């Protein structure tokens with residue numbers, strides 16, 4: 001390994017294909033090419049589900065299982081439960097002094113999320129402030145590399161900004177994380193939307209059966225105006241093609257259906273039927289891996305408790321350097 | 332010692348006659364009819380002193396010395412360093428979900444502080460949400476009684492609202508704090524301004540030599556319309572008489588001085604000379620104990636390290652109930 005990479009998810013439900021193409025398979029590969037930390041963002045989940053704590057609790061082990069089923073080896077990845085690392089909240093408080101309300105107010109991702117949630121000015125303080133909580137996560141674990149979807153760059157950049165101001169004001173003991181950009185943008189939902197999410201109900205979960213995956217693909221949005229096979233169709237806006245573009249290994253094969261489709265002799269069903277097995281092929285192992293851990297629940301809890309202990313040790317080391325850099329009384 | 336009282340100060344400079352009249356005297360009283368905790372809030376002090384960590388650090392011990400000098404008994408009061416109790420930062424983050432940005436912006440006392448600070452919109456985030464970290468301080472130490480001036484009432488009411496919301500959402504595990512209202516009007520500065528402050532340069536510190544006190548009193552604003560002794564002078568607005576009301580043991584004398592002053596023949600000199608005698612009597616025992624704790628520096632450190640340990644333990648207990656009430660993973 002080499003760089004410390006920090007990635008994570010708000011435990012609110014089971015992971016889906018979006019996480020897969022979006023990042024899971026990426027960390028699966030940088031897992032032996034670096035020191036991977038996966039944060040089950042328990043606390044950040046509550047800025048949104050503070051009134052559904054049961055929901056979050058249940059999903060920590062659920063997402064950890066998704067992690068294991070996806071190919072993350074317990075011997076190479078450190079899984080950490082955020083709430084069991086209070087050092088993160090402590091650094092979040094110190095970090096809140098390094099940024100202004102106005103600056104937090106212009107974060108494009110949080111702004112859209114607020115508008116989507118319908119909060120108005122009645123935004124929960126913890127949610128409005130979550131980007132700095134993420135900044136604390138990154139710096140506390142000493143992460144130098146952070147995979148970021150095109151959508152999470154503002155947060156990465158604000159972390160670098162907070163980290164830089166911290167090093168200048170106190171002592172340079174924090175590392176500025178760099179971003180790792182990806183190719184496949186936010187995998188769209190079955191809906192045809194831009195975001196795939198169990199909330200939106202347009203998702204294919206990693207634990208869905210072979211039947212459900214097929215069903216999901218069959219109901220997947222395709223292309224209006226294209227009423228019957230024969231007719232010519234267009235790829236743009238069609239989620240089946242952007243799906244194949246992230247789950248199908250043979251592009252020469254992909255670019256192929258793209259030709260016929262634009263012509264008239266490739267029924268939407270054919271594209272779908274094909275895609276459903278390209279998905280079944282990428283999921284086949286995942287299902288069997290899941291089964292293994294489902295039978296070995298003790299192991300899942302192991303992965304989580306051992307990873308958390310390990311991550312806390314790193315967080316505590318960093319906070320020690322932080323508290324002395326800040327000249328807090330006693331250090 | 333029945334109800335638990337929590338009071339505090341942000342360590343940013345030495346304490347002065349304003350703190351003595353408006354809080355410390357009552358505090359020396361409370362340590363005998365309650366379990367008194369006094370928080371050296373260096374975390375909160377950093378909300379606006381994040382660019383001067385050294386100043387805050389050096390004032391933790393300096394204010395503790397002032398507490399001792401003022402008569403706070405190391406055997407009756409628990410003095411804790413906010414910094415040393417990370418549980419407070421942990422609880423503030425969870426409390427952040429129970430309040431809206433909208434409601435935080437409406438706080439009249441923080442709104443005025445932001446106005447006097449001149450931040451504009453460039454308000455540091457830590458400062459904007461400091462009322463919540465304070466609600467965390469109260470709830471964590473399990474305080475049921477909090478001395479308050481009508482200026483800190485919205486801080487208190489907001490703690491009450493947060494405690495209530497936390498109890499309804501999770502479990503009724505936090506004690507609702509009750510106010511111990513005012514201490515009668517705040518002491519004005521030497522120049523008659525509404526506020527006494529080292530920054531405004533119109534304060535008498537508890538540590539000032541009997542000499543210095545004398546000098547500061549002589550330079551006091553009085554009555555712009557009073558020019559010589561023979562002339563009648565005004566009492567209202569005259570801080571010299573406001574000082575006399577707050578510390579002169581016998582009102583019969585204060586009234587007589589007031590009378591003769593409005594009449595004529597009583598110059599500012601005689602009046603101030605008497606004020607010096609009264610302040611030296613109130614301050615004398617404060618200087619002696621202060622001097623003592625200067626010989627026995629370990630005694631001051633002992634006062635803070637021990638109170639902190641007790642405080643830390645109390646906060647750990649509350650967080651335990653908090654983590655279980657919130658159904659956090661592993662609790």
Ligand SMILES: N[C@@H](Cc1c[nH]c2ccccc12)C(=O)O
Pocket residue numbers: 337338339340341370372375465468469477483486
């Ligand atoms: N002046 C500080 C004093 C303080 C800090 N933390 C506290 C907690 C409880 C009561 C008072 C305080 C304030 O506005 O709060």
